[PDB]
Amino acid sequence: EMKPHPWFFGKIPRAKAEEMLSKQRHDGAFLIRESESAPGDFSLSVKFGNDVQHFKVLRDGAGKYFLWVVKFNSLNELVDYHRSTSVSRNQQIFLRDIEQVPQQPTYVQ
Ligand SMILES: [Cl-]
């Protein structure tokens, strides 16, 4: 387990998502962020070799979420579909979780 997703980064700037994804080793390492050029839309950012690619998360009339053709009731479902179906029309790029760098625990009383 019941965990928050390691892929939702809220309002991190496009350039910050590139900075962070640039240090991931593995093609497909990705995050969802909340676009700053289109308030209320999401964007998908994904490591590919020396590049970081960005995808608009598109909405149909009912609020369902898609990248190209196949659409879902949630970002979570969209993301999970694209773990095994390429996000790209030019390369086979499958979504995989960031490595992370996770949280040293501290107690603050
Ligand atoms: Cl595919």
mmCIF file of C-alpha atoms and ligand atoms in Angstrom:
data_model
loop_
_atom_site.group_PDB
_atom_site.id
_atom_site.type_symbol
_atom_site.label_atom_id
_atom_site.label_comp_id
_atom_site.label_asym_id
_atom_site.label_seq_id
_atom_site.Cartn_x
_atom_site.Cartn_y
_atom_site.Cartn_z
ATOM 1 C CA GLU A 1 2.508 -2.894 0.491
ATOM 2 C CA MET A 2 0.000 0.000 0.000
ATOM 3 C CA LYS A 3 2.458 2.669 -1.125
ATOM 4 C CA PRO A 4 2.442 6.066 -2.818
ATOM 5 C CA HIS A 5 3.639 5.858 -6.407
ATOM 6 C CA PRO A 6 7.338 6.682 -6.944
ATOM 7 C CA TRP A 7 6.406 8.453 -10.159
ATOM 8 C CA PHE A 8 4.239 11.401 -9.212
ATOM 9 C CA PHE A 9 6.187 14.578 -8.810
ATOM 10 C CA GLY A 10 3.401 17.201 -8.909
ATOM 11 C CA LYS A 11 4.451 20.686 -10.096
ATOM 12 C CA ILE A 12 8.138 20.083 -10.826
ATOM 13 C CA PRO A 13 9.249 22.218 -13.782
ATOM 14 C CA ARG A 14 9.858 20.540 -17.165
ATOM 15 C CA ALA A 15 13.538 21.344 -16.858
ATOM 16 C CA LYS A 16 13.755 19.893 -13.331
ATOM 17 C CA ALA A 17 12.208 16.592 -14.528
ATOM 18 C CA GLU A 18 14.906 16.534 -17.242
ATOM 19 C CA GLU A 19 17.601 17.198 -14.647
ATOM 20 C CA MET A 20 16.353 14.347 -12.483
ATOM 21 C CA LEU A 21 15.735 11.859 -15.294
ATOM 22 C CA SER A 22 19.099 12.602 -16.888
ATOM 23 C CA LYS A 23 20.779 10.850 -13.917
ATOM 24 C CA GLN A 24 18.676 7.669 -14.147
ATOM 25 C CA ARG A 25 20.560 4.808 -15.754
ATOM 26 C CA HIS A 26 17.675 3.015 -17.425
ATOM 27 C CA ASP A 27 15.712 3.806 -20.528
ATOM 28 C CA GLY A 28 11.998 4.194 -19.655
ATOM 29 C CA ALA A 29 12.688 5.708 -16.181
ATOM 30 C CA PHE A 30 9.828 8.204 -15.902
ATOM 31 C CA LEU A 31 7.639 10.547 -13.999
ATOM 32 C CA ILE A 32 4.239 12.310 -14.272
ATOM 33 C CA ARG A 33 4.266 16.039 -13.475
ATOM 34 C CA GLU A 34 1.680 18.778 -13.664
ATOM 35 C CA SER A 35 2.443 20.970 -16.666
ATOM 36 C CA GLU A 36 3.322 24.618 -15.977
ATOM 37 C CA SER A 37 2.634 25.761 -19.626
ATOM 38 C CA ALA A 38 -0.786 24.183 -19.625
ATOM 39 C CA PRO A 39 -2.194 24.522 -16.079
ATOM 40 C CA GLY A 40 -4.499 21.533 -15.230
ATOM 41 C CA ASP A 41 -2.832 19.160 -17.732
ATOM 42 C CA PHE A 42 -0.308 16.481 -16.983
ATOM 43 C CA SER A 43 2.950 15.705 -18.732
ATOM 44 C CA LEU A 44 4.947 12.545 -18.890
ATOM 45 C CA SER A 45 8.765 12.741 -18.839
ATOM 46 C CA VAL A 46 10.927 9.734 -19.735
ATOM 47 C CA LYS A 47 14.661 8.971 -19.996
ATOM 48 C CA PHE A 48 15.882 7.777 -23.342
ATOM 49 C CA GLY A 49 19.667 7.423 -23.784
ATOM 50 C CA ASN A 50 21.108 10.890 -23.535
ATOM 51 C CA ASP A 51 17.707 12.450 -23.987
ATOM 52 C CA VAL A 52 14.634 13.105 -21.949
ATOM 53 C CA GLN A 53 11.393 12.882 -23.892
ATOM 54 C CA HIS A 54 8.119 14.588 -22.946
ATOM 55 C CA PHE A 55 4.612 13.464 -23.728
ATOM 56 C CA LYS A 56 1.320 15.426 -23.278
ATOM 57 C CA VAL A 57 -1.237 13.454 -21.258
ATOM 58 C CA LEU A 58 -4.331 14.042 -23.363
ATOM 59 C CA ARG A 59 -7.942 13.940 -22.268
ATOM 60 C CA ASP A 60 -11.072 12.851 -24.132
ATOM 61 C CA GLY A 61 -14.479 14.475 -23.528
ATOM 62 C CA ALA A 62 -15.215 12.385 -20.458
ATOM 63 C CA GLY A 63 -11.899 12.972 -18.683
ATOM 64 C CA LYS A 64 -10.174 9.732 -19.706
ATOM 65 C CA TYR A 65 -6.385 9.874 -20.115
ATOM 66 C CA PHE A 66 -4.256 8.907 -23.137
ATOM 67 C CA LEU A 67 -0.956 9.454 -24.965
ATOM 68 C CA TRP A 68 -1.887 8.377 -28.471
ATOM 69 C CA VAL A 69 -4.893 6.130 -28.924
ATOM 70 C CA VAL A 70 -5.553 3.866 -25.891
ATOM 71 C CA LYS A 71 -7.295 5.617 -22.991
ATOM 72 C CA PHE A 72 -7.937 4.992 -19.279
ATOM 73 C CA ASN A 73 -10.001 6.057 -16.319
ATOM 74 C CA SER A 74 -6.796 7.081 -14.399
ATOM 75 C CA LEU A 75 -3.205 8.308 -14.841
ATOM 76 C CA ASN A 76 -2.285 5.167 -12.793
ATOM 77 C CA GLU A 77 -3.925 2.971 -15.491
ATOM 78 C CA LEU A 78 -2.359 4.979 -18.337
ATOM 79 C CA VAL A 79 1.079 4.617 -16.772
ATOM 80 C CA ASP A 80 0.680 0.938 -16.139
ATOM 81 C CA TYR A 81 -0.420 0.232 -19.660
ATOM 82 C CA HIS A 82 2.647 1.958 -20.990
ATOM 83 C CA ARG A 83 4.981 -0.201 -18.940
ATOM 84 C CA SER A 84 4.455 -2.911 -21.584
ATOM 85 C CA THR A 85 3.304 -0.912 -24.646
ATOM 86 C CA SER A 86 5.759 1.690 -25.948
ATOM 87 C CA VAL A 87 5.188 5.381 -25.174
ATOM 88 C CA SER A 88 7.105 6.161 -28.405
ATOM 89 C CA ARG A 89 6.359 5.857 -32.090
ATOM 90 C CA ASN A 90 10.060 5.967 -32.973
ATOM 91 C CA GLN A 91 11.675 3.693 -30.322
ATOM 92 C CA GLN A 92 10.588 0.961 -27.997
ATOM 93 C CA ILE A 93 10.462 2.780 -24.681
ATOM 94 C CA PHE A 94 8.661 1.121 -21.850
ATOM 95 C CA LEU A 95 7.865 2.927 -18.612
ATOM 96 C CA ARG A 96 9.818 1.670 -15.560
ATOM 97 C CA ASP A 97 10.015 3.091 -12.076
ATOM 98 C CA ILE A 98 12.719 5.543 -11.199
ATOM 99 C CA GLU A 99 15.514 4.052 -9.090
ATOM 100 C CA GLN A 100 14.627 6.713 -6.430
ATOM 101 C CA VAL A 101 17.381 7.811 -3.876
ATOM 102 C CA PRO A 102 15.045 7.151 -1.023
ATOM 103 C CA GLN A 103 14.671 8.963 2.253
ATOM 104 C CA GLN A 104 16.980 8.474 5.195
ATOM 105 C CA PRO A 105 14.535 8.168 8.087
ATOM 106 C CA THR A 106 14.733 10.787 10.810
ATOM 107 C CA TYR A 107 12.721 11.331 13.910
ATOM 108 C CA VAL A 108 11.606 14.940 14.679
ATOM 109 C CA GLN A 109 9.707 15.278 17.975
HETATM 110 CL CL CL B 1 4.900 -1.893 -27.943
#
